[PDB]
């Protein structure tokens, strides 16, 4: 890595050094070629595709290797990042707007299960909370896969349409908003919740099954009303409220000190537009990507991190 | 043309004019050559088969210039209704059958399907309702390509089968029925709809997804007709989808209630039978033995029977 | 045959018969003759590639006249055997070896697709059921050329491969399985299936058109999913059932007094092989027969049965 990091195991695996090491240091030596090598094909292909455009005459087609290079980075995204990411719980909330926010909600969640299916992804309902009209009040789930939570961490944050409301005919434009909370799930292993600790409730489903856990110290608390039984219920209860509880704790570790708008993204449909802000990166396929086509979005994510943040100068 | 219509832009074309004028009407003048020599290529070759039928012993061969005879039709078609008809929203739904009905719905769906990738034609399922058995309870989409419009037309009406149904172990054959509709599509600039005159109305999907995603339901108040969709789409998407629809059914409904309120059933179009393997189109009274390979997609053949007969007397022939 | 059916054809052809029995006499007479002609000329080039090996110095052309012998073969079988047409169904699947047994299945299926179009058959393929990798896990289809169910009921058994997994990068010899089936198809008139003894049912495609046909005694089960129209599949359904339960009753009337392994041949890269085990017969030219080249083998299996089997002492 610069070369640097690459010095270091040109030296190690000299003659000398235990088994346990030398399996250690050439396996790392080895995830340095692929990093050196994918960037290397980003790199070539990049400064490929920018001669298909002023040619004389642009070849139509940089978008199969427009499409590689989203590919490219997710790989080495991948690489770089210390490890364990492939499992997620994904939670969608309405913003401001009423009705019209909770459908954003919806169209949001329609997005990411379009995506899910698209990345060979695995995806479970763990509720949702509809809405007379078919929007969403709520819901979380979760998303495992090859760098699902990698990927999706990217979608955190609040979300905003702007859009003539569909049962409004020929009306104004709309401005809806809606939150995405992406969060890692934590196994049991990974983390102590203390069996006193838990505070267990069950009720009738108000007009399958209802329960709910308070983790009394913290104050945590999920509640799910779903078809699964009380006894799977409790389970899924469980797994939200680890990764609820590991963050809370990360946060009450972190924000003791860190003493709004934050809109993370915009879909405007007359222009068929979106525009994550973070990166100012605008892209005239709203339908698609809303169609579960979101790659290009959190590839161009992906490069602006790996240029300028953690994994680069560092 | 005729020699009538090539006269006008004789003198037309005559010295002065103006300058959108010059290519407007010798653009026109051109259109009346090709569909005069297209005329001469479908008579050079139709009259060299006939020879080539009794000339003292047959070369069947006369199929290879009989397509390209189905073929010169459709090109001149679309040189005789020069508007746009290159988009068109096509409907199926079982007849009488129950069960069998609705396969045979079906068998349409997948011939039109197959079809209209043979024209290399662009198809989009607006949406479909299937049965267990496998069939097709009910099925609309759209369909774009060169006069793809004008040459689905002729297969507006009810198509009959004629089969032992395929869970029907060997046994007696029965008949069914298939609704195909049509219609040519209608942009937004060509219909009004007020605002006012329409309730769009969305609801949950019933019974990941859930049932479906979405649900939007658009009635146009004034006239009743209501398009109804539950399918993949968003809301926003299906609202599109069902404002395509909406268009196409109030602008064929309005031709109704303009000739229906001077113009005061079996109607059988068509008929597929397999133990035959014919299918004989009931307008023309054309029949071919190739059933399966029209059924597969190969359907040019009876779509030119009809060009033919229709321009050989409608509107293009005397007109 | 022998001298002896001929004997009575001599004698039948006396003085008189019929016209419809004259022609019939007359044809398999001159059959026999043409078994006795190519019995003769099998016999003579043989007699003659020995003495241009150990002549004094061989000609290596014997090749040539090896070649032949292949032919002779074939239309002496012709001649010979059962009726047996030139139409024939048949059928590969995976045996022992997880992933690579479907890998060599569709070796197998590449071979006879390869083969068939050198002997100038037709083959249309009645269904595939492909796996990511490339293998089959299940393909029948059908061959229709002179005697094309003969040359190839020799193929009929357990096929296994020893090499190394084209995926393993340098490992181990893996050794897996194939099974093949050649069935002669049977046309509805020359087997009789009563309406009532069979179920025919339809679904929707998971994932163009789904049946499958039961036939209630037996237990038979054809499935079809594919392209075709429910119709169409059924039809070739039908085909297929006809063949299995024909076959089904040859054996359920022989399978009854004849009371696992049976490697019928083995293929083996490193050392570029086929043996076939029936007739412990070794060829060198692996890879010339894996693309079609089956002639080689096959003929070697027709010069057994017809020296050992019926058509000999017989």
């Known amino acids: 890595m610069k070369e640097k990091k690459k010095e270091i195991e040109k030296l190690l695996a000299r003659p000398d050094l235990t088994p346990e090491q030398m399996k250690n240091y050439g396996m790392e030596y080895a995830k340095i070629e692929e990093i050196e090598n994918i960037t290397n094909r980003i790199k070539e292909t990049q400064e490929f595709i920018e001669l298909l455009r002023e040619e004389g005459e642009n070849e139509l087609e940089i978008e199969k290797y427009e499409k590689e290079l989203d590919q490219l980075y997710q790989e080495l995204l991948f690489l770089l990042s210390p490890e364990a990411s492939d499992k997620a719980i994904v ?16 169209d949001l969640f329609r997005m990411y299960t379009r995506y899910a299916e698209r990345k060979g992804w695995n995806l479970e309902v763990a509720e949702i909370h509809e809405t007379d009209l078919g929007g969403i009040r709520e819901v979380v789930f979760f ?83 779903n078809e699964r039984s009380q006894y799977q219920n409790k389970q899924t209860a469980l797994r939200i409220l680890r990764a609820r509880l590991y963050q809370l704790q990360k946060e009450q570790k972190e924000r003791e000190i860190s003493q709004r708008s934050e809109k993370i993204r915009t879909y405007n449909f007359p ?43 560092l």
Chains 1, 3 share one sequence.
């Open 143 to 225: 998303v495992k896969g090859k760098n699902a939570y990698g990927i999706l961490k990217y979608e955190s944050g609040v979300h905003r349409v702007q859009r003539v409301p569909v049962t409004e005919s020929g009306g104004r434009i709309h401005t809806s908003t809606a939150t995405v909370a992406v969060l890692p799930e934590i196994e049991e292993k990974d983390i102590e919740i203390r069996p006193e600790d838990l505070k267990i409730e069950t009720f009738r489903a108000s007009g399958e099954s209802a329960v709910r856990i308070t983790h009394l110290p913290t104050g945590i608390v999920v509640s799910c009303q």
């Open 271 to 313: 222009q068929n537009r979106v525009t994550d802000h973070r990166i100012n990166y605008t892209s005239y396929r709203l339908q698609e990507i809303l169609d579960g086509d979101l790659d290009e979005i959190i590839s161009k994510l992906i490069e602006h991190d790996i240029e300028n943040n953690l994994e680069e100068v």
């Open 91 to 106: 939670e969608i909330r309405p913003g401001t707007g009423g009705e019209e926010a909770a459908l954003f909600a919806r």
